[PDB]
Ligand binder design. Sequence first.
Ligand SMILES: [Zn+2]
Lengths: 267, 38, 49
Amino acid sequence: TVVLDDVELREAQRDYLDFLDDEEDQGIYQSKVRELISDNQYRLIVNVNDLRRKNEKRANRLLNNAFEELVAFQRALKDFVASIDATYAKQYEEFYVGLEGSFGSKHVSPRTLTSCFLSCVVCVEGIVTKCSLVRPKVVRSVHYCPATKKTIERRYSDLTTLVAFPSSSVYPTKDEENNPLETEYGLSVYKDHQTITIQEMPEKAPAGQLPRSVDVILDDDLVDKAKPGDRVQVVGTYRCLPGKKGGYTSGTFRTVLIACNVKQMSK
Amino acid sequence: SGFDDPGIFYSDSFGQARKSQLQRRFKEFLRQYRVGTD
Amino acid sequence: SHLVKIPGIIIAASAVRAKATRISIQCRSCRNTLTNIAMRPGLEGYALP
DNA sequence: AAAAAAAAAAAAAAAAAAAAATTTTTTTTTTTTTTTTTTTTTTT
DNA sequence: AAAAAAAAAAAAAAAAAAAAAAATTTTTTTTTTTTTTTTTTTTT
Ligand SMILES: [Zn+2]
């Protein structure tokens, strides 16, 4: 079911390819690309005020509906960093886009992270509370059959937020001939995964009231950027989670904030 | 560590006759039916 | 169900159709196989698991 | 002119295919409670 | 200044909520193959 073309995605990718194209301007984002290529870091931080001034409508669209918009942004980023250096752009299967700037209405606190801001990149200050063990998550798993001298690469899609199916979640262990498959851990590919919990600051929070906190899933690139007790500003995508399969549902949808970036709020 | 499931293994049998022994006696019938007179 | 010996004259002999003695079945979701089940010989059916 | 071969139409039977389908129990998690140790604080 | 008493902390154990986990063939339909019967067309 490969899509032949979509006007929305094509338009958005063109707009952000223009936004990254910085030579007629002062060269700020081109310089950012060049320095991050030199660093080997693979996230580029785009200021929302820059995006708003160059195209307010795209800023409204993105801050109202993130994930597919940022897929467009990141595909544009991959094309752009390939034009600067195809060899480096080939190196990483994805590159990422952090945010920064004046998230005017999109700056709330975990007390005020209502159910109006879903799939919207929200900005939120707060104190960490937990630091779960940063443990791997498998993304592309390679297997070897010694009976048949065979190799396979099962592929996994990061459906941390969408609907996920057992057919997607299968980890193969036997061939079609019921032979034994041995995992190739090194040849496989993994990304770190950590959960943390931001909290409304007690200096900011209401005086007499219980704390309120929000869960934050830091995948790779953001492993140890937040320990307990630290002040941190998290900007990212509040969303819903899928309940695991079962013929019943209550309406409950425990929600998270898949952080797009986190910075030291101490400033 | 829990990413695999290697198969069971077993060994050859060391030690109304059972169906395996009837199998053995059919094998004997085929292997030793001597028809040609001395 | 005991071996019997019978004379007769054949009158109609159907065409040789392929019947399965051992099979394999795949799972539609997990795509794992139950290789080489044994079909009980005769005009004996087989219910799938 | 009578016989018969062919045609279309109608019917029976065997093989394959079609369709129908929630409830009970277990386990993690959260939250408090209680014991006992440790720590701190007040007294002579 | 050190002893006694009290308060708080740390750690183990228990009770309920709510999300997960597991079990799970048989009867009806209907297409296709085969045969059968009445008729028309053709041949002796
Ligand atoms: Zn399966």
